[PDB]
Each structure stands twice: as C-alpha cells, then as structure tokens.
C-alpha cells in the first residue's frame, strides 16, 4: 500500500549452521562449532576457554560439545573473540547466562559487543545480536593465562576496529605447536577510501597484514575455516591444506589492493 519493509533476519549458508562433533587440533585444542564457523575449546587442568561461538543460535550445540569433552558449565571460565560480529560472537550473552564464563576483550570489541553489533561502521543495524558485557578489557600484547595455556592478544584492526589475533602454544606428540587464531583480513563491501567512520582504515589493514605475517604460527586457524584452507568436514585431513600466516596475509593484501582498484573504478 506500501508498508515499510519487514526486518530481515541475518540468514546464512547452511554449512555455517551445520553441527559437527569436536575435531581435535592439538592436545588441549578442539574445534567445537559448526562445518563453516570456528569455535575453539581449549581445555586445561584449571578450566576451559572458548574462542568465538559463531552464530546466536549455536549456544546449545557448543554446550553439548563441551559436555562431550568433559567440560561442564562451571568449567568454562573465559570467552575470547576474534571480532564482535553476529556470526562469531552471536551466542556470547546466552553462554554467559548458562555458564560461569567471563568475557575478555579489547575496548573496541567490548563496545561493539555491548551494543549487540548495532551501529556497525559498515553494516549499520543489519547484523544485530544479543548484547553482552565484557568482564575484562585487554590491551595489545596483553597475556591471559588459563591452566598454563598463555593467550597473547595481537590487535589487527580492519575487519573490525577491535579485530584480534589470539596466539598460544599447545603440544602434539610432546612437541610445541604455536597456534594462531587470526581474524579475517577481508573488507567485504566496505568503503575503504575516505570512509568518514574509519578514516585510517587503509593504514590499519596494512599494519594488520604485517602483524599477521609475523605471528608465531605453526598452525593458522580463522573464524571462517575456508579463509585459511581448513576443511572441518575432512576428518584426519581437516588441517592438511591450511595456509601459513604468511600466505594468508599475502593473499589478503593482494585481494585488498584489487579491491582498492575496483573501488576507485566503481
């Protein structure tokens, strides 16, 4: 007649929502999210840590996978985030309600999370989710230790202002494995140049490529597995084709330079 449009739900490919059983990455580190969204459980003798949770509706699944690992609601001490978008921080508020988990995040991720991803720099209110409060604010290079796994925050602003790569050392076969869980280094449909909401976007992405390429990185994981050539459905070969941090960063930078060119053209 004509009415305003209905609200549109943030709808995603089915594989993003497909449950999987825990997939072991190293002695204490498991993928427990879906086939196409990363949620890392790190289990220690002094509690559990979750890095990302995926979409809002994944909370019960994650909890089931935690129980399958021996991790009870009280055992979950800490939630860490790559970035505070709906598709990776979605279930955080619910998890905080159903577990003993406390969130540690940088100021940028905390503010975005506290607004449930509303007023996004690029997407406006198209990707909102339940808001949650951070319990601890972390600085660049700050370390959080849980049961002798030491997580180091490496800011890598761009994809979001508060994007973070979290690094830690696990073991396999008695040998150290230096794991890097790096955020996306894409800029999907973003205005890169002269963006009033993010004036130094380009400078930040460039620094973030250099940050990521230099990470301690025997194994790279990304919030979307595909971005690092992981295949979570491939069992014993899941991680076989995984990129190095160096390769992941080079690819991201070459794509960004091509995106700049297209933006100037468009």
Swiss-Prot record:
Task: State the activity regulation.
Answer: Inhibited by Hg(2+) or Cu(2+), and by chelating agents such as EDTA and O-phenanthroline. Reduced enzymatic activity in presence of cobalt, nickel, cadmium, and manganese.
- Between which residues do disulfide bridges form? 217-245
Tell me about pH and activity. Answer: Unstable below pH 8, unless zinc is present.
The primary site where this protein sits is periplasm
Q: Which cofactor does it need?
A: Zn(2+)
Sites binding Zn(2+) 1 sit at 83, 85, 159
Keywords linked to the UniProt accession: Antibiotic resistance, Disulfide bond, Hydrolase, Metal-binding, Periplasm, Signal, Zinc
The catalytic activity, as recorded, is: a beta-lactam + H2O = a substituted beta-amino acid
Q: Where does substrate bind?
A: 183
Q: Which sites bind Zn(2+) 2?
A: 87-88, 224
Compartment(s) of residence: Periplasm
Gene Ontology cellular-component terms for this entry are: periplasmic space
Give a GO molecular function annotation for the protein.
beta-lactamase activity
Record function comment: Confers resistance to the different beta-lactams antibiotics (penicillin, cephalosporin and carbapenem) via the hydrolysis of the beta-lactam ring.
- To which protein family does this belong? Belongs to the metallo-beta-lactamase superfamily. Class-B beta-lactamase family.
Quaternary structure note? Homotetramer.
Official protein name in the record: Metallo-beta-lactamase L1 type 3
Which species is this UniProt entry from?
Answer: Stenotrophomonas maltophilia
């Amino acid at each position: 007649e004509v009415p305003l449009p209905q609200l549109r739900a943030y709808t995603v490919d089915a594989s993003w929502l497909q449950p999987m059983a825990p997939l072991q990455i190293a002695d204490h580190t498991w993928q427990i999210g879906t086939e196409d969204l990363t949620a890392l459980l790190v289990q220690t003798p002094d509690g559990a840590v979750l890095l990302d949770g995926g979409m809002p509706q994944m909370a019960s699944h994650l909890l089931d996978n935690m129980k399958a690992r021996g991790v009870t609601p009280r055992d979950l001490r800490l939630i860490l985030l790559s970035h505070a978008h709906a598709d990776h921080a979605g279930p955080v508020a619910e998890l905080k309600r159903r577990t003993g988990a406390k969130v540690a995040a940088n100021a940028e991720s905390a503010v975005l999370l506290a607004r449930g991803g509303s007023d996004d720099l690029h997407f406006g209110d198209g990707i909102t989710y339940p808001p949650a409060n951070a319990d601890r604010i972390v600085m660049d290079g700050e370390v959080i230790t849980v049961g002798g796994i030491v997580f180091t925050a490496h800011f890598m602003a761009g994809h979001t202002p508060g994007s973070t790569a979290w690094t830690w050392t696990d073991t396999r076969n008695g040998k150290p494995v230096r794991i890097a869980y790096a955020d996306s280094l894409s800029a999907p449909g973003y205005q890169l140049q002269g963006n009033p909401r993010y004036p130094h976007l380009i400078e930040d992405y460039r620094r973030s490529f250099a940050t990521v390429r230099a990470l301690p990185c025997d194994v790279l994981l990304t919030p979307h597995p595909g971005a690092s050539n992981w295949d979570y459905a491939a069992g014993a070969r899941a991680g076989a084709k995984a990129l190095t941090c160096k390769a992941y960063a080079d690819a991201a930078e070459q794509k960004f330079d091509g995106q700049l060119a297209k933006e100037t053209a468009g």
